[PDB]
Amino acid sequence: EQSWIPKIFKKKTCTTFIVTLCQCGRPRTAHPAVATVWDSDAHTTEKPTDAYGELDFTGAGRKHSNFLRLSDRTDPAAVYSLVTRTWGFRAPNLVVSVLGGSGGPVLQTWLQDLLRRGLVRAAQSTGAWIVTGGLHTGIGRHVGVAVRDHQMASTKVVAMGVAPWGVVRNRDTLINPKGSFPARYRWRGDPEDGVQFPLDYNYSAFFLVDDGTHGCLGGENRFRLRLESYISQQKTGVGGTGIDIPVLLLLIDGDEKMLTRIENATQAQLPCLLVAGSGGAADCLAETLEDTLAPGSGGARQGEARDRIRRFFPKGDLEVLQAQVERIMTRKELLTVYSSEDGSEEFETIVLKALVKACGYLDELRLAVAWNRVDIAQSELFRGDIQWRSFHLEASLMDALLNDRPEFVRLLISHGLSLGHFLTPMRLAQLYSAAPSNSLIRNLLDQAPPDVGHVLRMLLGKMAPWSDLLLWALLLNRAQMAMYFWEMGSNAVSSALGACLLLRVMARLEPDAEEAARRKDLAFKFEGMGVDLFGECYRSSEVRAARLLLRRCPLWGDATCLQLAMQADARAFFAQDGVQSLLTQKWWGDMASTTPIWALVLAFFCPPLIYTRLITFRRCLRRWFHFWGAPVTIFMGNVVSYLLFLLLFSRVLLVDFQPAPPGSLELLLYFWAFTLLCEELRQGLSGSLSQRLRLYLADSWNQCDLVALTCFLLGVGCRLTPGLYHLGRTVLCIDFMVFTVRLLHIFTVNKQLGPKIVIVSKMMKDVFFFLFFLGVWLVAYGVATEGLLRPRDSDFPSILRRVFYRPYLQIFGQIPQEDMDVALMEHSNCSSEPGFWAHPPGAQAGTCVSQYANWLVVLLLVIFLLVANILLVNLLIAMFSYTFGKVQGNSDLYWKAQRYRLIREFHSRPALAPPFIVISHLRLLLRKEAERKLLTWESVHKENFLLARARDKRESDSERLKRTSQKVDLALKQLGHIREYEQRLKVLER
- In the bound state with a copy of itself, the residue whose beta carbon lies nearer, of 932 and 977, is 977
Min dist. Cβ of residue 91 to a copy of itself (A): 24
Site for a copy of itself in 528-587 (CB under 8 A): none
In residues, how long is the chain? 990
Residue 145's binding partner, choosing from Ca ion, a copy of itself, none, with beta-carbon cut-off 5 to 8 A by kind? a copy of itself
For position 660 contacting a copy of itself by CB under 8 A, the verdict is no
Q: Which of residues 259, 335, 417, 474 is near a copy of itself by CB under 8 A?
A: 417
Give the shortest CB-787-to-a copy of itself separation in angstroms.
5
Min dist CB 556 to a copy of itself, Å, is: 38
Q: Kindly state whether residue 374 participates in binding a copy of itself, applying the rule CB under 8 A.
A: no
H/E stretch holding 689: helix 689-698
CA–CA distance from 161 to each of 33, 98, 170, 220, 495 (Å)? 34, 11, 17, 11, 52
Please spell the DSSP secondary structure of 285-323, one letter per residue.
HHHHHHHSS--STTTHHHHHHHHHHHS-STTTSSHHHHH
Please give the full DSSP string across 913-957, using - where no structure is assigned: -HHHHHHHHHHHS---HHHHHHHHHHHHHHHHHHHHHHHHHHTSH
Task: State the nearest-atom distance from the C-beta of 686 to Ca ion, in Å.
Answer: 12
- Piece of the chain touching a copy of itself by CB under 8 A; list 282-290, 515-523, 904-912, 966-974: 966-974
Q: Tell me which of Ca ion, a copy of itself, none is bound by residue 974, counting a contact when its beta carbon lies within the kind-specific cut-off of 5 to 8 angstroms.
A: a copy of itself
Nearest alpha carbon to residue 353 among 332, 367, 374? 367
- Binder to a copy of itself among 612, 691, 908, 974 (CB under 8 A)? 974
420 contacts a copy of itself (rule: CB under 8 A)? yes
Q: Does 799 bind a copy of itself (CB under 8 A)?
A: yes
**CA angle at residue 339 from 333 to 344, to 5 degrees?**
135
Q: According to CB under 8 A, which residues from 377 to 396 bind a copy of itself?
A: 378, 382, 384-385, 389-390
Instruction: Give whichever of 184 and 751 is closer to a copy of itself, judged by the CB atom.
Output: 184
Per-residue binding string, Ca ion, 698-737, x by CB under 5 A, is ----x--x--------------------------------
Using rule CB under 8 A, residue 761 touches a copy of itself: no
Closer to a copy of itself by Cβ: residue 268 or 799: 799
The nearest distance, CB 960 to a copy of itself, in angstroms, is 6
Q: Any contact of residue 418 with a copy of itself (CB under 8 A)?
A: yes
* DSSP per-residue codes, 119-144: IHHHHHHHT-EEEE--SSSHHHHHHH
Nearer to Ca ion, 140 or 637 (CB): 637
By the 8 A CB rule, do 732 and 653 touch? yes
Q: Which is nearer to a copy of itself, 881 or 964 (CB)?
A: 964
Residue 832 is a binding residue for a copy of itself (CB under 8 A): no
In DSSP terms, 207 is beta-bridged to 162
Is residue 546 packed enough to be buried (19+ CB in 10 Å), middle (13-18) or exposed (0-12)? buried
Binding residue numbers: 148, 188, 199, 244, 363-364, 389, 416, 680, 683, 702, 705
Q: What is the C-alpha to C-alpha distance for residues 855 and 821, in angstroms, rounded to an integer?
A: 8
Instruction: Confirm if 366 and 399 have CB atoms less than 8 A apart.
Output: yes
Positions in 172-191 near a copy of itself (CB under 8 A): 184, 187-188
# of chain residues touching a copy of itself (CB under 8 A): 77
> In one letter, which amino acid is 257?
K
Least distance to Ca ion from the beta carbon of 676, Å?
Answer: 9
The interface partner of residue 702, options being a copy of itself, Ca ion, none and the CB cut-off 5 to 8 Å by kind, is Ca ion
Q: How many CB atoms lie within 10 A of CB 287?
A: 16
**Identity of the residue, 706 or 714, whose beta carbon is nearer to Ca ion in the bound complex:** 706
Q: C-alpha angle with apex 459: 455 to 460, nearest 5 degrees?
A: 120
Instruction: Report if residue 969 touches a copy of itself, rule: CB under 8 A.
Output: yes
HEC-encoded secondary structure of 40-69: CCCCEEEEECCCCCEEEECCCCCCCEECCE
Nearer to a copy of itself, 25 or 61 (CB): 61
Measured from the CB of residue 152, what is the shortest distance to a copy of itself in angstroms? 7
Is there binding between residue 327 and a copy of itself (CB under 8 A)?
Answer: no
* Residue 748 in the binding site for Ca ion (CB under 5 A): no
Interactions with Ca ion, residue window 644-703 (CB under 5 A) = 683, 702
Q: Which does 799 bind (CB under 5 to 8 A by kind): a copy of itself, Ca ion, none?
A: a copy of itself
Q: Is 639 in the site for a copy of itself (CB under 8 A)?
A: no
Residue 193 in the binding site for a copy of itself (CB under 8 A):
no
Binding residues for Ca(2+): 244, 363-364, 680, 683, 702, 705
Burial class (CB in 10 A: 0-12, 13-18, 19+), 694: exposed
218-231: buried (b, 16+ CB within 10 Å) or exposed (e) per residue? ebbbbbbbbbbbbb
Lay out the site mask for a copy of itself across 256-285 (x = CB under 8 A, - = otherwise): ------------------------------
Site for a copy of itself in 45-104 (CB under 8 A): 57-61
Look at residues 227, 204, 240, 246 and name the one whose alpha carbon lies nearest to residue 87: 204
The listed partner (a copy of itself, Ca ion, none) that binds 783, CB under 5 to 8 Å by sort, is a copy of itself
Say which entry of Ca ion, a copy of itself, none residue 804 contacts (CB below 5 to 8 A, set by partner kind).
Answer: none
Nearer to a copy of itself, 27 or 835 (CB): 835
Beta-strand pair 205-210/158-164: parallel
- 654 in contact with a copy of itself (CB under 8 A): yes
Dist. CA 423–CA 100, nearest whole Å: 47
Contact 762, 755 (CB under 8 A): no
Under the binding rule (CB under 8 A), the answer on residue 794 touching a copy of itself is: yes
Break sites following residues in the chain (C–N > 2.5 A): 19, 35, 155, 360, 448, 463, 617, 687, 927
The SS3 call for residue 178 is coil
Q: Which of 413, 470, 570, 676 contacts a copy of itself by CB under 8 A?
A: 413
Please, what is the end-to-end C-alpha distance for the chain in angstroms? 70
152 binds a copy of itself (CB under 8 A): yes
Q: Is 984 in the site for a copy of itself (CB under 8 A)?
A: yes
Find out whether 67 and 102 touch, Cβ atoms under 8 Å.
no
**Which of residues 453, 717, 787, 841 is near a copy of itself by CB under 8 A?**
787
Whose Cβ is closer to Ca ion: residue 315's or residue 745's?
745
787's contact among Ca ion, a copy of itself, none, with CB below 5 to 8 A by partner kind, is a copy of itself
Choice from 362, 423, 783, 867 touching a copy of itself (CB under 8 A): 783
Decide which of a copy of itself, Ca ion, none touches 829; Cβ closer than 5 to 8 Å per partner kind. none
Work out whether 234 is an interface residue with Ca ion (CB under 5 A): no
Phi, psi of 38, deg, nearest 5: -65, 140
- Which parts are annotated binding residues for ATP? 148, 188, 199, 389, 416
Chain centroid to Cα 577, Å, comes to 30
Residue 131: phi and psi, rounded to 5, are: -115, 115
The CA distance from 655 to 422, in Å, is 82
- Decide which of Ca ion, a copy of itself, none touches 988; Cβ closer than 5 to 8 Å per partner kind: a copy of itself
DSSP three-state, residue 418: coil
Q: How far is the CB of 711 from a copy of itself (least distance, A)?
A: 32
Smallest distance, Å, CB 989 to a copy of itself?
5
Buried b (16+ CB within 10 A) or exposed e, 933-949: ebbebbeebbeebeeee
Give the footprint of Ca ion on this chain (CB under 5 A).
Answer: 683, 702, 705
